[PDB]
Amino acid sequence: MAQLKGSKTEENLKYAFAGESQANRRYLYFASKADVEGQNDIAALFRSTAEGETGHAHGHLEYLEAVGDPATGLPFGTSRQNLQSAIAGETHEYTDMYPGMAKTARDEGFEEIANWFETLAKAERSHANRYTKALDGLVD
Amino acid sequence: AQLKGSKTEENLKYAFAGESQANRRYLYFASKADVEGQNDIAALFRSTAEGETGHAHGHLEYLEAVGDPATGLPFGTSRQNLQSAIAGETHEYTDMYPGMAKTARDEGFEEIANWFETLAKAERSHANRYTKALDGLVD
Numbered sequence: 692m693a694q695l696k697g698s699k700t701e702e703n704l705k706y707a708f709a710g711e712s713q714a715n716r717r718y719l720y721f722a723s724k725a726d727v728e729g730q731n732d733i734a735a736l737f738r739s740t741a742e743g744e745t746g747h748a749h750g751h752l753e754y755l756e757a758v759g760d761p762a763t764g765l766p767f768g769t770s771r772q773n774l775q776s777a778i779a780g781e782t783h784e785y786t787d788m789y790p791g792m793a794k795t796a797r798d799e800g801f802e803e804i805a806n807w808f809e810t811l812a813k814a815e816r817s818h819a820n821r822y823t824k825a826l827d828g829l830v831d
Numbered sequence: 832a833q834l835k836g837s838k839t840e841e842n843l844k845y846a847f848a849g850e851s852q853a854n855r856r857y858l859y860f861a862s863k864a865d866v867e868g869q870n871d872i873a874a875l876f877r878s879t880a881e882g883e884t885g886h887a888h889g890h891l892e893y894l895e896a897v898g899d900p901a902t903g904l905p906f907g908t909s910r911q912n913l914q915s916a917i918a919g920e921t922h923e924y925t926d927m928y929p930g931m932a933k934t935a936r937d938e939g940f941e942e943i944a945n946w947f948e949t950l951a952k953a954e955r956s957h958a959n960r961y962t963k964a965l966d967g968l969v970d
């Protein structure tokens with residue numbers, strides 16, 4: 692638990708959590724590509740492996756509960772804590788991250804990617820708003 | 832304008848990492864809600880997680896033009912995807928997880944060291960299954 696704070700192992704858990712999260716997403720993408728190809732056994736293999744990566748990421752997050760949410764630095768655990776962290780993250784995404792990435796895409800000559808980032812800014816704003824209403828009505 | 836070597840390429844990789852993590856985080860939060868009996872909050876975290884799956888999917892579609900953010904290798908076809916997955920998993924079981932276990936043991940986190948060692952063994956097994964699948968792929 693707490694002796695983790697400020698260690699290299701803390702940073703390794705965060706890195707491994709990021710890698711495992713991405714591995715799940717990547718393997719599900721690969722599974723859908725296998726679906727389209729009619730490669731049903733390969734698809735099923737990707738999905739089974741992706742499920743293993745979910746368990747791995749879950750374990751990393753269990754350990755990180757001692758130090759804070761890797762996306763925000765905020766405590767996590769209870770639903771009130773979780774909503775507060777998700778709100779903070781989402782708010783940062785819609786106010787700064789995606790609009791900044793949109794502007795840069797546009798200025799580099801990637802109009803469609805800029806429009807995509809703007810679509811995502813709108814999406815995260817809707818997430819942040821829904822989470823806030825949920826927290827506002829929470830009875831714990 | 833070429834995506835390869837652009838600031839936008841790097842931003843798509845970063846955004847992909849963020850979106851991937853957001854889905855894992857929100858699913859974890861959904862399980863905490865389930866245990867507390869906050870079933871409406873659980874459903875909101877799951878719904879939101881599904882949105883983040885879409886976002887990650889779209890970032891990956893753009894990154895197909897440049898390479899797999901985990902390995903730098905091409906992806907698209909099952910042959911390419913297996914090859915990339917094998918390369919990533921091999922890095923994790925030979926280098927990443929053993930390095931992390933050594934640091935954890937050195938810092939006195941013995942349980943965590945063993946966790947990373949267990950994961951190294953799991954990724955080796957992943958690599959081996961993907962290699963078998965690639966070997967018999969009808970392509």
Ligand SMILES: [Fe+3]
Nearest residue numbers: 711743744747
């Ligand atoms: Fe894993």
Ligand SMILES: [Fe+3]
Nearest residue numbers: 781814815818
């Ligand atoms: Fe969101």
Ligand SMILES: [Fe+3]
Nearest residue numbers: 850882883886
């Ligand atoms: Fe998102």
